[PDB]
Structure formats: structure tokens, C-alpha cells
Amino acid sequence: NQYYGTGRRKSSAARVFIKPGNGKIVINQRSLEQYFGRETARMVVRQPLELVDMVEKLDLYITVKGGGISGQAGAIRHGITRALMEYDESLRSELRKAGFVTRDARQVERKKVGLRKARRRPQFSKR
Amino acid sequence: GQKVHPNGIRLGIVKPWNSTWFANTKEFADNLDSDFKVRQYLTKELAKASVSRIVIERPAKSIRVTIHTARPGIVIGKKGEDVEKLRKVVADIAGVPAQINIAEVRKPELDAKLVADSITSQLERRVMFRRAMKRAVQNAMRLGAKGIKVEVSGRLGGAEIARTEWYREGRVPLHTLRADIDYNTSEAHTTYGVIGVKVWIFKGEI
Amino acid sequence: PRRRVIGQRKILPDPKFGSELLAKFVNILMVDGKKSTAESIVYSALETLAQRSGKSELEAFEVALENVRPTVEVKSRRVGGSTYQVPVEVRPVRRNALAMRWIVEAARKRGDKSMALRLANELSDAAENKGTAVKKREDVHRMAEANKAFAHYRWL
């Protein structure tokens, strides 16, 4: 009845659900315009809704937990993408070529002993 | 450079912990001290008993000590009088009753403690170190060592300057994690100083 | 760099207009890891120019870019023990990169009411080509003319 998607940008998890509708999206029991304060953070969510024509026909309940503002937005983007994967599976040549199915495995690096910022080594004098 | 301890690095993989007991932070250091007391007292008066490994277990209401050695006859005595005296003292150390299980090693020369303590003991008995290390290596290979390495260092032969002497036969893949290396270190207190002895024994992988 | 050669880094394009250059411009304008505010000011600057110039602000920023994009550079080198400022033609990926960088600090020295306002005036004045950007580009052109004497030095 409801197509499912999962998204994770950096350290967040996204729960994305699809139903037919009139192009309305609710995020954590809250409108997206109220939730994502940043304009870029707002419209990255709806980026895949242009090359895919289903923008006006999908009501989209989403719950996203963890991470930060940009991370949650990237997680939201990846979750909608996957939720579409179990619907049409025929727009791959376009959607992959944009780069949305790809899971961003890039991650924050652990701190190292003898380093200040896990790669920055302390400034030293040669003498 | 310096090497990681081959037991410590492979402790979590192939090397069973000597202490295999659990508790909270409340009695962690307390029971750690008791294990120290037990092991040091046990070693000191079983120095002749060829003690190799001591495994301390702490069931919920007691302590169990498994002594892997090569001479069970000495450590038990007649009809078990000695193991009961060790029971009294070891139990009183930790304040709880103690079970003692004695396991025997059929091949002493394939365990890194017996070879190490023997080589050390020969030094204060004034056996020359080159021959001693060679005798150990030949024994291991004959009795089925896949690889051997012995390290005798410090004040060799009464000289003024300490020298490093090592000799490796066979196969010692230290950097291989699945490799089974039994390592031990023993010491020699001689009239011209103190000598360190290191033994690596490889006995196959996985 | 010394063993394995690698190409450029791909940057997600501008979301509001689909450009790669606007995203790169705002990224190089970004300071101290703050892209949230950087996006806000770049949108405000382009819309002020949209109402001032023609409706399609895309072309207005484009022309303000081309009249300041540099095609010749100055590179410091030492071959025989003397300082050589060799001029070389720069490939377009670096052409547009150096142009927008200079514009970034050009706005900072303008000193207007706000950072958004000074960028808007800088980008507008570049469209008429009276801008301090064109001033800097004429400055690099005179020293480039001067470096044509160095142009035939060692490592031409």
C-alpha cells in the first residue's frame, strides 16, 4: 500500500513513505517549510521530483532521526530515492546518471593519537 | 623498532585469556589483586614444578585455578597432600573456596615457558649461552616445531658490553594474525647482570 | 601530484538555477565553513541584478564574468638563478577560478552597508566594465605586457 525508502547521509536515518496524493509532504509531523529553515536544505528534498514527473501525484509521509541539518536533508534525499526504486525501476538511466541512488559512504574520521583534529599534526619548531 | 606482544595482539582472536572472569567496577581491581597474589605466590614456591600457564576462573561463589605444567607428580605429592595445602593457602588468599585442576603438557619443549625457563636456569648454572640456545632449537624441531626463534640478550659471557644474540629456524609469521605463536619471556639473574630470554614458537595457523 | 595524476573535483551544481559556476563561486566565497549564509547572499545579489538589468540574470553574471576572466597569468620561477615571472596561457578551468576569487576580495574592500549589497554593486559595475575587477584586470594586463620581455626567458 505504501512504498518504503531509507536514507542515510552522514549519521542520520530517514523513514520515507509514498502514497498517491496531491503533492503534499509532511516531515516529523511538521511541514517541510517549517522544519528545514535553510532554502537549500528545503529544495534538495524536492530535487528528484522534477526529473521524475510524480511530484503532483504523491503525498509523502517522512520521519527522519539523528544527524544534523545538511545530513538530515541528504538522508531525506536518499530515502525518497530508494522509495521510488520499488515503484517504477524503469527510470534508472536518468536517476543514476544524476547520482541519487548512490549512498554517500563518506564519513567523519576518528581522532588519532598524536593528532589534534585526526589529521592535523601539532605545529612544531625544527630547532 | 619495537614489536607488539604476540600474545597481546592475538589475545582476542586465538589466545585464550589467562583470566576468564567477569564482574563490575566494584570488585574489578580487588579480584585483579587477588589474581596477582595467587599467581606470584604460586610461581615462587613452584619454581621447580615447571609451572607453565596459570588460568584463574571465578565462578560466582568460588575461584578455580588451572595449572598447566609438565611435572604433575611434584605439584600433587603423595595422595594429594600438597594440592590440599595449596588449596588452603590459595583459598585464604582470595577469601573464598578454591578448586585446583592440574593439566599436564606432554610436549614441554613446544611451550614457550618451559624452554624459556630452562635456558635462563642454565645461565646461573654457567652453561654457555650459544650452546644453550642451540640445544633448545634442536629439541623443538625434533619434537615437531613448525618454527622457532630464541632471543638471549644482555651481558653475554661476562663481557663489559651487552650484546644481542638470536637464532631462528623454521617459520615465525608474527604479522599473520591467524598464526599460532606461543610467546613467553624469562629472565636470568647472573653474577654479571641480568639476562632476558624471548621465545617464539609457531605451531600452525587457524 | 608527484606519482598519480588526477582530474578535477565534481561539485554539485547550483540548485536554484542549475549552474556549476554559481555553486563554485559561493563555495569559494564561503569562509570558515559557513555555506548556509553564503547561499542566502548569493541569491540576494543575483535578484538585485535581475531587477536592475534584464530579467534573465544568468547572462548578466556571465558578462560580468567574461570581462574579468583572465587568459594570461604570471608565474614565478628560477632557472639560472634569476627571478622569472613567466607568462603562460591558463586553461579555462583555472581562468574562471582565478577571476571569481579576485572578485571575492574586491567586494570586501568595497566597504558598503552589507556584504550582500557590496557583492551586488561589484557584480553590476563589472557588467558596465567600470568595476575594480576590470581595474585589476587592466593591472594584470600591464604587468603581462611587461612580462612579454620575460616571455622568452628560460622555460618559456
Add this chain to the structure above:
Amino acid sequence: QRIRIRLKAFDHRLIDQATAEIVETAKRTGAQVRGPIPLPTRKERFTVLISPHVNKDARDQYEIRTHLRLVDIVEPTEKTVDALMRLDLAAGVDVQISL
């Protein structure tokens, strides 16, 4: 009266052996049971300086991992509780039965 079994052990292999030897004892006394759940394993990391006199960059990191398992018994019996007391288990796992 539904009881809740808590098991702590350093080694992950040992907790699985423990939680797999309690359950068939429950079947030996013959009572229906519920599946053990993995509660978040806790990892403790001690970073210790290794040089005896002086260094700072030479320091090793040692972690203690304690794994925690939960069991829920739905319908206990005196024979079932007698089995929990009588059954012998490994010294590496502690008992935190709760009524």
C-alpha cells in the same frame, strides 16, 4: 509473574553459549519462553602511555567490551526456578534474575 533474565559477559561467543544453554533447560522443565534480545553492547576504551619515562605519541588503546542479553520468561514454575538455580553455567557470565 513474568521474570527477566540479564546476562553480562566480556566475550560475545560466551553469551551466546550461555543463552543457548539456559533455553533448553527451560524446555527440560517444559515451559514456553521468549527469544533473547541484544541490548546495546557497551565498549570501554582506555588509552595508556606505553613508554616508561617519556613519550606522548606512543600510546596504546585498550577496550573492554561487555555484551548484554535479556531473556523474558512468560509462565514460570517452581520446577523452572529450581532448574535456574541448579543449572551450572560458565564463570564468565553473571546472573541477575529479577522477580
Add this chain to the structure above:
Amino acid sequence: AKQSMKAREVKRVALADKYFAKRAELKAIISDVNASDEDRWNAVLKLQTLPRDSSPSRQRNRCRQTGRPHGFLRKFGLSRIKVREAAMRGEIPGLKKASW
């Protein structure tokens, strides 16, 4: 360390054991409570009167196996390097070298 230092520390912990439950906590609470008056002043005199070695702050936890004042760990009760070598021999359960 030093046998004198270890003997000093055993005496210190014994006196703290002896006195922590008998006067120390109650004198602290009766000085903190605002219901009482000037009985706190009398209490402060007797508190100073004690041998003064009874304060647990007078104690410095040291490696019991070696007595080293610095580089101590509470969970293991040992010096930093003493924990390391004992761990390599395998004497601390569930302990290994971390990686993450």
C-alpha cells in the same frame, strides 16, 4: 616506589576507614544545615581536633603492585604501564587492543 611511602598510605587509609563513619559525615552535615546555630562552630573545633590524617582527600591512590603515584587507573588499581604488560600476558579479562 618506596616501602616507607606504601606504609604511609596503608596507615592513611586505615584511619580514614576508622573515622569516616563516626564523626566526619555528621560534622559535615551539621555544618551545612541552616536549622542549627553555633553548634556548627563547636563542631568545627572538634573536627580540627581529630588527627587530621582521617580525610580521604589526604589519601592518594597509587598502584598497589608498585606504589607509583602517577599514571593511576581506578578500574584496574594499577599504574599505566603495569596495566599494559599484564594485559599483554592476558591477565585482564575482555581486554585487548582497540581499533576503530
Add this chain to the structure above:
Amino acid sequence: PRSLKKGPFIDLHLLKKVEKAVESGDKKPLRTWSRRSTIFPNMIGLTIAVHNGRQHVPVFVTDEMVGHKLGEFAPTRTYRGHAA
């Protein structure tokens, strides 16, 4: 500073010796090692030989000094200067 609920600070030996001297009249300097004690008005107009580490420095108790501590008027370091 010690909290107002806890009151000020004073040492038992110092307190007992100050009151005896006050009762018997200011006769002689009071020998002390307890620099941590606080100057209380009961010892006004008295000379206290406060210890600094090597020599007990006399101090006279005056009204404006009350509340400050007994060991405050005993500089334990002697630094003339880095010049000759």
C-alpha cells in the same frame, strides 16, 4: 573564602592561646605556625610571631587588618631584584 554559613576559620591551639593571653593581658608575642588561621578581633593590639618557613615574623594586630589571615603578613620569598 569559607562560606558564610560555615563561619570564619580559627585553630584550636591558636584560639585557646589567644584567649588566655587576652585574659592575662597583652604581655608577649604569640608563637605560632598556623598561618591558615584567620585574624579575629579578640586578638586586637597584639604581636603575633607568624612563621614564614625559616623565621617567625612579628605582626601587630590592628583594626583594619581584621578578617585577613594570620599568614598573610609573612612574605615567604625574598626577591630583591634581578639586577645586582
Add this chain to the structure above:
RNA sequence: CGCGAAGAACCUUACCUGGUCUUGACAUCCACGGAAGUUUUCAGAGAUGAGAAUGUGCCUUCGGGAACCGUGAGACAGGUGCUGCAUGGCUGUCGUCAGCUCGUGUUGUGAAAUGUUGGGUUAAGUCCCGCAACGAGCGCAACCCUUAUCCUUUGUUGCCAGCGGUCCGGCCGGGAACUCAAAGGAGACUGCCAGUGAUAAACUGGAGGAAGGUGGGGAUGACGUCAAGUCAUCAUGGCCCUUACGACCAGGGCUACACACGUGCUACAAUGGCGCAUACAAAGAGAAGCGACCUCGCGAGAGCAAGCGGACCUCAUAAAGUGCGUCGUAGUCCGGAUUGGAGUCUGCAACUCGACUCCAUGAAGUCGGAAUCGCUAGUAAUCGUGGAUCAGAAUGCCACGGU
């Protein structure tokens, strides 16, 4: 050179002044009386000395012991006293650099050589081709840890698509699908296509793919160099004290200041300051401990006290962010030193010499010379958070997440 010190008020402490002891603070043995403990007072800075009450345990062949207590004698204990250039152990360094060797064969009278060189290639003595070399080993890589994707297993203390109830808040029955927790398993191998190349190895591009070229980091540090560091973790040969280089105390010092250097934190501002409203993290700690709610206090805190040995309870809410209005380029609604007054909490005690709060003052500084350092991707940069050490005492150290 923010090194040992993961934390000097006392203690630590090893230094100084002064008071003190001389089988000794600590261990074994010899003799005597004796259980420890509790109340109390006097001298003293305390050590210690002195006064006074209660007490006498167990097995017992009633012959002794242990917790031990106190005095005398001796073997002596004790030395953080010297030599790291006598040593063991441990560590730094080049450096995670790619090297270090052996067997057999062959060459050379021989020491030895070859293999290991050469054309390429690789992160690599990695691989390929050639080559009197053929193989092999220690190192490289792989196996271990974590993160990136999915499948299966269990569902509370964690989750709420659907069912109904909904004190309309996952709160209740209820569901295990999902986020998540952790246990096992699958996948990433230049596997296939094309181009370059010397039809080889490799390199480049592509397809699929969550991830593509070691997927990103961690652990792992060969043979050896530096008479490298440590005799003050420890053990140890030799050397020296042993009425003193040992030991018990109180105060002091390790925090001193004409100056120099190194490592950092806070700034000089408008991408900012100031005020209000508003949203999300990860990692850890916690039983002599974290401490809610409620009340008082401008406040740090105080009172009462719930719960939590913890996926529940508590530190715990994040900060730059966004929306609003003012500041309007001014040594300033910047900057925060310094200084005064008054306070809070720890602790026997905050003067030398702790941290924090409120009010009062507001120094240099408007981005820094020669020179010099870090960093190639979630990395610099920047913003907060936690831990150990810890009674109290971070801008240091170790970790975590946000942009």
C-alpha cells in the same frame, strides 16, 4: 621544551627551615604483658609524650597462635643515594621506509657472486617480461577491528506503517513491517567491455553496482642505526650511607621574575556583536556516584527529594543554524585582560596557592617583519559535547558529533 605530571593548598614530595627517632615507618625471627575499639582531658606546630575509664574473643592435651599492640638485643631492614657508558624490561627515531636473507644449482683459485640485476609497473623486492638461475622464508599484502549496502534471526528498557482505543502525548491493548540494538551470512575480485601497452603485467575509460580499483580510516613497525631515553614504574651487577644519603612530623618550595624561546587558548570584529522565538546529534560517565521535579536565591548554589548498577533514571541540553528587530564601522552594544567590592562550592584548612557567579573598571590589540608550521576530502577551517586524572582544581590530553 601543554614532555615523565591521566591534574604540587595539606597529601602527592623525592627539596628547604625547624622540632624529632635510631632493629627503626615497612618484613622475618627472640623476650614480657596483653583483643581491637569507644568516651575524656593536658603539654606541644604536630609527631610524640602524659593522664583516666570500659574490654579480654576462638580451638583447646589449657602447653600457643593469629588481627595484632608496646619496650630491649642482634641477622639487619631501609636509600626516588651514584653509574642507562654494566644491564633486563619498556620506548622514541629513520619509518610502514621496502627491504633482510636462505636452500639447491651455476660462476669465481678464493673471500664471495648470482638469485636481489635489467625493460616496464606498483602503495610495495607488487606483478610481468627478460635474465644461470630454480624455488623458499622473514617483511609488503591477506587473516583481526570499525564504517559504507543488503538478507536472515530475537523484540524490551528500544521502534510505531497498519488496526482499533486514543487523559489525544507511542500514552493503551496491539503489530514485529520498519528506524534501532547485535549475531550470523552475501557482496568488491581489475570480475566483464573498450582503448593505450611490449597480444604480458599493469594503466585509462566504461557498464552494472550501496561502495571500483588497497572503498574510506585503525591495529599490525623486518633485518638494523643512533654507547638514543629510562638505575625516579619496576627488577638488577657493581659503588656508597646505615645514630643517616634511612624514618615521623608542622610550616615553606616545586606557582619566584630585569629577559629569551617553544606549544596552545582568547581576540582585534559587520560572514560580526547584542536581544527574542525556534531544530535536530554522536560518544561516554555514574553506588562514599550521577542527581531530576518543586521551592528560595540576579547568580555560581542551597533545601526537600523521585529514580537509576542503567537502551528506562541523572549529568542533558547541544553550539555555529534560521526567522525576526537594533548596532552602522566608531578602540565601537567590539575585545577581554587587569583591578576593586561582595559571594558560592570542595576540603581539617583556598595567605603564599583552587575553580566558578553577581556588580564596578575596561589594558594591548584595527590581522601582525625577516622567517616559519599543519593540511589533498568530510580533510583543512570552525562550533560545541564527553571521558580519564579527579575531594576541588583544563585553554592540556584522549574521544564524539554538527556545518
